[PDB]
Structure 1
Amino acid sequence: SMNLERLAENTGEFQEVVRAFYDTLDAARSSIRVVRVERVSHPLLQQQYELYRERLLQRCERRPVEQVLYHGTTAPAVPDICAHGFNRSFCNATVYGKGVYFARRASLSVQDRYSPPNADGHKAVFVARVLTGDYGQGRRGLRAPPLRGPGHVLLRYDSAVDCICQPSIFVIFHDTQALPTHLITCEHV
């Protein structure tokens, strides 16, 4: 909470982020209000992230290798994420693996079970760049992405998902594979 910077409502960056948030808010597009949007700066994690991104850009089948995704969290977790990035050791049921869950659609992250509100009724949703790369099928046992199986050089997939077909959830298992960029503070009207 020391490397957060509030964005004014009348700026390009605030509008990009908020528009993308409302576009994917579905069910609750008209119940949810935005209180605040803050830029997250973590120069070190960003460098560690860019190095991983270079390795994936050089060798992934799927495109894109990188996606913007939402992570709802508890008020107490906000300082840690801003200081350290996403920490899978805080693992709700780990249905698709013991990793950090990101959602394609904000509708999912903004639910009270993922972003529970605090005493002021404020809900914490992070926007993150995530190196999804080549994803495999998640399942509850997974302490890492699932094995690629025989005849692949790479031992494991980059991430795990609910469903390979149209995936809506990504589970990532490396501290450097997800960079928080913005903290959206929202509430139910």
Structure 2
Amino acid sequence: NNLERLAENTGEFQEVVRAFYDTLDAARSSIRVVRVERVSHPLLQQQYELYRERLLQRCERRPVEQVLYHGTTAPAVPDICAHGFNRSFCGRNATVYGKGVYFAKRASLSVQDRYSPPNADGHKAVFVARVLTGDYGQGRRGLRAPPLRGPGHVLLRYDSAMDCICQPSIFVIFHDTQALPTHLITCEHVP
């Protein structure tokens, strides 16, 4: 398999859980981490690293890459581990910032049941991902691609879409090598 459980013991586990809890906000008191698995996908990772170096070479602005969260359903977990994030596996209910795959800066958003619904055991799946957001532009409802840059720009479209230029909290990506799942956090609601 492509998932490897990490020991609570480790620096990796602790930094991943630290960042998760540090952005749970309101939800922090009622969410418990069950386990954290490292995700491995050698091909996708190498494809991502190529996309990353190209963006670093092209983009004058920094950062080009962000750590973001993605809540999903139990059934989608194996597909995302095998094939990365794309529309066909990920939730296709959100259209307000475009018809792509949605990622959150803060876990408080991804831990909501509408995005990471519990399975039979009450377990919820939240991926942590390295995402090449690059140059993002304001998302538009129903758009199938990232928004157009317009005339002050040699490129046709932004690299990603976002909810708002003021404290962006949601990013929409439209290419399947633009986000590399690094970890899967299984968590649960606890009073």
- TM-score over 0.5 (shorter chain): yes
- CA deviations over 1:34-73 (Å, ceiling 9, x no partner): 0010000000000110111111101213310000000000
Q: CA deviation at 1:80?
A: 0.2
- CA deviations over 1:137-182 (Å, ceiling 9, x no partner): 0011211111111131111101000101210000000000000000
1:136–1:159: 8 Å Cα contact kept in structure 2? yes
5+ unaligned residues in a row in structure 2: which ranges? none
Q: 1:86-125 to 2 correspondence within 5 Å?
A: 86-90=85-89, 92-125=93-126
Distance 2:89 2:146 in 1: 18
Greater mean deviation of Cα atoms: 153-162 or 122-131 = 153-162
Specify the SS of the correspondent of 2:187: strand
- CA deviations over 1:62-115 (Å, ceiling 9, x no partner): 310000000000000000000000011346231110000000000000000000
Aligned residues: 187
1:61–1:134: 8 Å Cα contact kept in structure 2? no
Greater mean deviation of Cα atoms: 137-146 or 168-177 = 137-146
2:76–2:89: 8 Å Cα contact kept in structure 1? no
Specify the SS of the correspondent of 2:88: helix
5+ unaligned residues in a row in structure 1: which ranges? none
Q: Which runs of 4+ in 1 moved over 3 A?
A: none
- CA deviations over 1:1-44 (Å, ceiling 9, x no partner): xx100000010000000000000000011100000100000000
User: How much identity, in percent, do the aligned residues show?
Assistant: 99
Specify the SS of the correspondent of 1:139: coil
Greater mean deviation of Cα atoms: 107-116 or 93-102 = 93-102
Distance 2:19 2:114 in 1: 21
Cα-Cα RMSD: 1.0
2:79–2:89: 8 Å Cα contact kept in structure 1? no
Distance 1:33 1:140 in 2: 34
* TM score, norm. by length of structure 2: 0.95
